[PDB]
């Protein structure tokens, strides 16, 4: 076996040829950004939601 996969047809586990130990793969931390603001007629400050 060279490398694994999952249900969603994406790469999950990869074995390097240098060492018999296998390395898992998890993508970088991704997510939407959202802003929490009051009315601009009222105030100016904002709060960031990740």
């Amino acid at each position: 076996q060279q490398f694994g996969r999952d249900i969603a047809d994406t790469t999950d586990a990869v074995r390097d040829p240098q060492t018999l130990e296998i390395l898992d793969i998890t993508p970088c931390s991704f997510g939407g950004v959202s802003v929490i603001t009051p009315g601009t007629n009222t105030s100016n400050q904002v709060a960031v939601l990740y």
Partner: protein, 50 residues
């Protein structure tokens, strides 16, 4: 006037019906079709995109 002359009977029948429906909601496995179908439809439509 028919209620106050049969209060114990109505109470016993109500408790028996409550116990019966509590048993029947767990005995039959196909009594929860709609919620399982909508969550399975959502999961399948999300999986086919990937």
């Amino acid at each position: 006037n028919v209620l106050y002359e049969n209060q114990k009977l109505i109470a016993n029948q109500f408790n028996s019906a409550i116990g019966k429906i509590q048993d029947s909601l767990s005995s039959t496995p196909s009594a929860l079709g709609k919620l399982q179908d909508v969550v399975n439809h959502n999961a399948q439509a999300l999986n086919t995109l990937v």
